[PDB]
Amino acid sequence: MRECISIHVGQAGVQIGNACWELYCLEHGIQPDGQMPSDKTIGGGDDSFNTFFSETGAGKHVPRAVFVDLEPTVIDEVRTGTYRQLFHPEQLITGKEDAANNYARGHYTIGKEIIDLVLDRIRKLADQCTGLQGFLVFHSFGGGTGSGFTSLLMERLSVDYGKKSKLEFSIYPAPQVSTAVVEPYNSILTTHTTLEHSDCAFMVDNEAIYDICRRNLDIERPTYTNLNRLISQIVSSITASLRFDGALNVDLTEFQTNLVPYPRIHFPLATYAPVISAEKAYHEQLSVAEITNACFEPANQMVKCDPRHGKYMACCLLYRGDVVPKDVNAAIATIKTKRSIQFVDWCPTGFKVGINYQPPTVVPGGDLAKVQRAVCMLSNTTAIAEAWARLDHKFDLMYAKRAFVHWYVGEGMEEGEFSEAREDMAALEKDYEEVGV
């Protein structure tokens, strides 16, 4: 067994972390106080769930997580919330004044003052690990902490843990639930600085999740709580292979092997189905064929784009619930003849499939209905580059007038970093264009 440490940075990462660890506790039968009656080996073990939980002599199962925010408002709600007993006080790290939506302020001004404290608290969990394999980092692209501090942390982890895999869960900025007009700036800057330091990154466009909540959950104006519970389902699907018995995606290195053949193109598209409202009084359960086919409708993707106009480099199907291989292959054969699924010539046309028999768990009183079977598809398609184009155009529009650039220079950043980061994004878009057309 090899442990994984989760790092949650800024508001978006912290609040998504709460939703994920809440979901993990329900999934593994861990109570809010940390007790796990089904664990018969008290105070230790090397089970699959020990990848995410360490154990105390008193039987407490404690997340291998560190929460970091440059301001204390959000993490304080963890410190006082329903799951306060779960974490150890040293894993919740707060400053007093945040990054003010400024990448440079999070990276240079305030980050430099707190980076060493965080790395020491991270080192505290790593010393508790017999086989630490790497980290899962949750953050927003848009926030000053989510963008600026994360990139600083990511560069350091490469120095202190050069041998460990680093996975990202990244919240892509959307105007519908956005926080700042400068979010395109922070996105390009953080992507450029983090790119060499991430092995695999799952982007979640707040636009996609917002519309899924409106369209399928029947929620007029989704809250962060609505969005986060849905995101946590997708994260739990993606991480289930690390926490449960199984043959597919059992270590972080396997995410790179299975999903990322090129290092820079390491942003797999996630598609999840079915999303069903709890309020819906009558529901017809969807079959393996229906939910698998749903994996190729853009309206179900974490990022809105058109895979039909790109090429695939890898594709994993992660089912949970009542699914057998026979039904999966029958669905795949049907879908293959009817949809536009082009792989690149130097990769095989094939799906890696994993099935967990336990159906997805839903938070009591949440908005997601219990379903008999669900699937999360992770495909590495060039079509996700559409999100880079969308983001880079907004960056170009403001930067042509140097709008807001003074707020970054004022924090010690040179204007040249804007164009370096943008040129890297220009290179990234060109990389996707080669592989894709």
């Binding site: 519908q176 409708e297 309206a299 809105k304 039909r308 009817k338 559409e386 184009a389």
Partner: protein, 334 residues
């Protein structure tokens, strides 16, 4: 109001379309780079499809289908017909074609060119026109542009008086629902000099474009014969109608082509919607068989029909999504 942008200035079709929209009093034009639009009349090439459908509070429509180029490029149109089971190789309405690159299907093309020589039958091809293969291969590598080698229709239908050749142009509007609307008015783009069975360099009687001609204008105004006259000629000359002898095949070809690509380009469940106007170019041999020559993704209309067609585009494609306050189209059902 509704809003729209104009990003293709050289488009005569949508220059009229935008003009008509303004005249309603319910459509406001914006600048190229203003993103808060309801409708985009986008650029012919590198149109930014990845930026559409991400404006909250805006239903966005564009006048092009992403992926439609695979039907509107000669090299890709051949590839699509050979490789799509829905079309087959035994496709009976497309001339034998082979992709040839300037440096691929050159060994495949010459092996069938021997069957045309060992059988000693008609062996003329088009790329310019020649009866010997290696004559224009010297001209294909001469340009450094991927060319298509196509068997030329040696026995075309010829109109009298004149013993002339022609090509039929059909305008097809596909809306956001992927309904296929054939404009009821077509155009014959006629040759004015008589067709010579052995004057391949004489391009005026072999290539029937409106530019090459402009005896130009002798038999009909602008080398354009519309369906009223051509139908009458077929009645008098051949004892048949335009519908029976030609138009059934044309609607079959249009339906077949657009059904083949529908799964690849349909915007049924997309975050943005598409429509597009197509121009299909057809040939008619002497036994009244219709052949598909090319599909135009950015077609220009005929001068007499601009007003009616452009009003139809606004009718069925644009107002169908953005309402306000007989049909000229034949719905090709499926």
């Amino acid at each position: 109001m509704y809003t729209f942008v104009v990003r293709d200035e050289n488009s005569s079709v949508y220059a009229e379309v935008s003009r008509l929209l303004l005249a309603t009093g319910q459509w406001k034009r914006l600048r190229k780079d203003n993103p808060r639009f309801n409708l985009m009349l986008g650029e012919r090439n590198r149109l930014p499809f990845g930026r559409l459908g991400h404006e909250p509070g805006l239903v966005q429509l564009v006048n092009y289908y992403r992926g439609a180029d695979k039907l509107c490029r000669k090299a890709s149109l051949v590839k699509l017909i050979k490789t799509s089971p829905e079309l087959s190789e035994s496709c009976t309405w497309f001339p034998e074609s082979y992709v040839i690159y300037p440096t691929d299907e050159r060994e495949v093309f010459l092996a069938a060119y021997n069957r045309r020589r060992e059988g000693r039958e008609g062996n003329v091809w088009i790329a310019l026109i020649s009866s010997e293969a290696s004559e224009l291969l010297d001209f294909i590598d001469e340009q450094g542009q991927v060319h298509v080698i196509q068997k030329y229709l040696e026995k075309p239908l010829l109109l009298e008086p004149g013993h002339r050749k022609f090509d039929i142009r059909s305008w097809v509007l596909v809306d956001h629902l992927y309904n296929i609307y054939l404009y009821r008015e077509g155009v014959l783009r006629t040759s004015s000099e008589p067709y010579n069975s052995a004057n391949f360099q004489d391009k005026t009687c072999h290539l029937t474009n409106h530019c090459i001609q402009k005896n130009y204008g002798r038999y009909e105004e602008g080398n354009e014969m519309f369906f009223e006259e051509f139908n009458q000629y077929l009645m008098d000359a051949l004892n048949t109608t335009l519908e029976n002898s030609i138009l059934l095949q044309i609607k079959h070809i249009i339906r077949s082509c657009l059904m083949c690509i529908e799964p690849a380009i349909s915007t049924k469940h997309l975050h943005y919607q598409s429509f597009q106007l197509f121009g299909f170019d057809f040939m008619v041999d002497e036994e009244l068989k219709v052949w598909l020559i090319e599909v135009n993704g950015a077609p220009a209309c005929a001068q007499k029909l601009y007003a009616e067609l452009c009003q139809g585009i606004v009718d069925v494609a644009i107002s169908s999504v953005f309402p306000l306050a007989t049909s000229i189209f034949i719905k090709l059902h499926h």
